[model samples]
Target: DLRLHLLLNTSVTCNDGSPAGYYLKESRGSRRWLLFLEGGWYCFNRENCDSRYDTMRRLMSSRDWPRTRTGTGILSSQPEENPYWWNANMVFIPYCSSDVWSGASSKSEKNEYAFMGALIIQEVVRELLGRGLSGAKVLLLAGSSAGGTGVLLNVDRVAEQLEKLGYPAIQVRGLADSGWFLDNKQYRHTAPTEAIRRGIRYWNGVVPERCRRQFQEGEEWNCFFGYKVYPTLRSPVFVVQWLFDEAQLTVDNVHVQEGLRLYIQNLGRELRHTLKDVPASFAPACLSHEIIIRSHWTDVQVKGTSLPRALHCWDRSLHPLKGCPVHLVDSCPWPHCNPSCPT
Candidate 1:
């Protein structure tokens, strides 16, 4: 169950004009916080948005959303289940705006949708500042899938906003799981430069300003891809992208039942090219999609290290462990190369 998201301002609404919402569970004695955005696909235009509203109405409207949402995986409250952040104040925001959490457009008479994904996150933080988050020692902004892209797009903004709000002491970091989207020209012989172009226009999407300035006037959509924007990020971010990320295969429309080893290998290589900007990462050579949200999240490893340990070192950076691997990418070939990867 979750609560409504317009406690401070009633302006932010989902695509259907219903209010946005989030689930917040505060630990009794912890000053740390974990802010998460739930992931779902995005709709680039009116046709896509209309179809999304009919099929996945929940993602477009919070009218049917429940009063309480059960937080799991990284948002899990069990100490044994989520060792690193088990006791942190966990806040989970569901995906409803369908802009990959980057839109700032308000609904108008000219259009029937309101894309406020970016503003919703900002407003939630402002509202929470009054609720003990102002005293927070650390705020880890994390997400998976589209929400993962959201982390890449919004992490720096969150940090900048917090600092402007006068909480300059809170250490804000990013953990983007499986959001590294590769927009290879060969892949578009695949998709995109189409969807996102119309998407940014329809949603009035807002990318990080630093990243936006790098691109030309209309190419701000490039920021939707993790690699393009990660370099512009001023915050410390640890990326978690599978070497043979399944979603990436969908991006290139590749069916791996035949001889495409070289193609898959190149996909992994290109992904690494996009990943080099971030300081810390854990890329296992697994043919899967997401990890940080899996119950067995720690089961997948690059070498002899686990994801939790890698993330702990990333967040702590105190490594006090002489040899803990921080940037662990599978050196072996892709697709089931890691024995620890889930089948």
Candidate 2:
């Protein structure tokens, strides 16, 4: 009985003058639009925001996303970035409201993007929360890969903070995604978590133990905030694992070793299964640490379309997105479920 659909796009945009729009349509006769922002590389088309919007419109709107007659795609103005190099530092010139762009700095554009992205989600959620869903008590905030990371990373703290300000009591459930793990010190590719952690620390002027502790529960940000794991067998959650294409690797995988390390370190009654199901387990004879530090894994392979078979713990239906070579896509539980459902 859940509504089903899909949205695909690299959600990041420049903070420049152009406001981008999204194409959307209603399926299953449900009214409220399920808005999603993809978490791929943001700087792909940093200049021509229109072409990026067109590419996304053509791809994502091949299904849902209501279209305009003139096809001036995307509902609102999209985000654009104006890059500047000042003193070996990169600056982002944004073109949004004063509040969104008040203190644009050279070193902190990406952080602002992440922060703005969260605000976008907050705006979307506020709209949804006002809708009066018919007793659908749980607001299952889910995403895959980085998006999954964002949900877990921001959900609890964001929710608590908003609740304090008198927001509605919408219960945000759990999150699931493939290739996810925790720990800021354990980024898979580059120093994203570390950099962001530092940025937050800088914003506070004093490093917060809670920020470091946030990465502790694992990469899924929710783990940091203290949300209980949804027992999928009993609860309404279905986490699907996506195996990285054996042939692909990226700088963001600094923590592959950590995932394997955690598996080995936390042996238990479920040891055998846990090892296999560990967030970013390594292949036979492959070391996650070596791959992370060196920025490459030589023996990565595609292994045909049947990777989930190669990796027994993964759900086969979850495929990778179009562009990310090593990255795989996963449909939580099953891909066809509604609200980009979990299980």
Q: Taking the tens digit of each residue's C-alpha lDDT, what string does model 2 give over 73-140? A: 11111111101000111101111211111111221455422223444344444434334322223344
Encode model 1's per-residue lDDT on 137-241: one tens digit a residue. 888999998989999999988999999988999988888998888876444352666788889999988999899999968999898888788888888888999
Top candidate, metric lDDT: 1
TM-scores vs. true structure, each candidate: 0.94, 0.38
List runs of model 2 lying over 4 Å from the truth: 1-14, 17-37, 42-115, 131-136, 161-169, 182-239, 243-248, 252-343
Candidate 1 residue spans exceeding 4 A from truth: 1-8, 185-190, 256-259, 318-321
Best by TM-score: 1
